[PDB]
Amino acid sequence: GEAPNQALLRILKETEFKKIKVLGSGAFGTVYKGLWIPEGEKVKIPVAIKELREATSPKANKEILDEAYVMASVDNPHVCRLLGICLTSTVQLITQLMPFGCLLDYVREHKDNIGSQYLLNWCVQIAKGMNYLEDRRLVHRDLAARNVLVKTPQHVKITDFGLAKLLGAEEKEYHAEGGKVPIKWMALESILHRIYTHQSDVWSYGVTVWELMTFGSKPYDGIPASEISSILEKGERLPQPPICTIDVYMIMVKCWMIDADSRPKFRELIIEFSKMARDPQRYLVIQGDEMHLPEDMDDVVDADEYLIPQ
Numbered sequence: 001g002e003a004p005n006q007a008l009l010r011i012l013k014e015t016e017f018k019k020i021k022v023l024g025s026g027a028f029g030t031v032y033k034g035l036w037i038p039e040g041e042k043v044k045i046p047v048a049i050k051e052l053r054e055a056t057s058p059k060a061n062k063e064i065l066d067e068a069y070v071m072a073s074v075d076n077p078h079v080c081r082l083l084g085i086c087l088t089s090t091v092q093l094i095t096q097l098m099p100f101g102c103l104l105d106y107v108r109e110h111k112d113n114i115g116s117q118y119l120l121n122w123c124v125q126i127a128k129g130m131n132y133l134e135d136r137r138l139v140h141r142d143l144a145a146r147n148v149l150v151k152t153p154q155h156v157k158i159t160d161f162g163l164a165k166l167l168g169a170e171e172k173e174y175h176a177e178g179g180k181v182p183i184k185w186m187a188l189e190s191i192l193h194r195i196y197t198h199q200s201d202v203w204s205y206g207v208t209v210w211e212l213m214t215f216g217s218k219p220y221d222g223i224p225a226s227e228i229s230s231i232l233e234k235g236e237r238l239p240q241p242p243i244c245t246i247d248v249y250m251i252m253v254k255c256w257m258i259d260a261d262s263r264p265k266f267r268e269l270i271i272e273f274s275k276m277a278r279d280p281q282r283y284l285v286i287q288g289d290e291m292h293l294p295e296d297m298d299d300v301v302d303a304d305e306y307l308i309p310q
């Protein structure tokens with residue numbers, strides 16, 4: 001680590017957010033939905049506001065500000081940008097709204113309508129997204145279908161930097177605290193040595209692709225977490241999904257290889273899936289493919305078009 005992080009954290013007035021309406025509740029916290037209307041600008045930006053439960057127990061305010069710190073330090077089409085924070089009672093994360101939600105829910109709730117062109121394209125976009133984070137020396141640690149949001153069915157972005165970690169020109173690993181990370185998405189060296197690395201994200205990427213190819217299945221739906229370690233140890237891996245050619249499945253397996261360095265690089269995955277996406281019917285055999293996917297507001301601009309220096 002060495003280059004200075006000259007990102008801008010923007011504090012936003014609680015009086016700039018109209019039309020609030022709870023999106024997802026949940027144990028962890030609460031995501032809202034609203035309209036951010038910059039102070040003296042004829043623009044209304046559709047936003048999600050995240051206020052994670054734990055009342056004010058400063059323990060929270062940490063996680064939420066680390067989230068913010070990272071989310072504010074990323075500029076990529078395939079990664080969610082932090083719009084700003086709000087210093088109300090508790091802190092709030094304000095970010096571009098992703099109208100179609102989680103990619104996980106999105107595939108779950110659209111199976112009989114998702115073409116191969118999309119699935120392969122998303123894998124491209126998530127690989128692009130990750131490669132970016134690789135460049136910004138940044139280990140996501142929690143890549144899952146549930147952390148990819150959908151802007152439009154042809155444009156996804158990665159999110160949830162709750163466990164993300166910056167590295168160093170020195171550093172190559174991240175020796176975690178007391179683990180609180182999903183087992184079914186984490187590399188084998190993550191589950192035994194609490195080691196995290198870019199190549200560990202690769203594994204999670206593999207599992208993510210596995211989720212999409214299976215339209216939302218739960219990795220190891222049977223097996224309980226206290227057992228995951230043992231299974232992978234013996235050699236077992238996720239099955240090959242129905243719609244999946246060997247070409248595509250073998251990419252998934254390559255991500256789950258015991259020697260981390262033998263795993264593909266995200267820049268290879270971009271290339272590989274990118275090739276594949278030029279002829280999607282040849283790598284994915286989806287029954288029915290060849291599929292279509294879908295007060296006043298003059299002043300609405302997507303965040304993606306709301307810029308300002310930097």
Ligand SMILES: [Cl-]
Nearest residue numbers: 104146217218
């Ligand atoms: Cl679930």
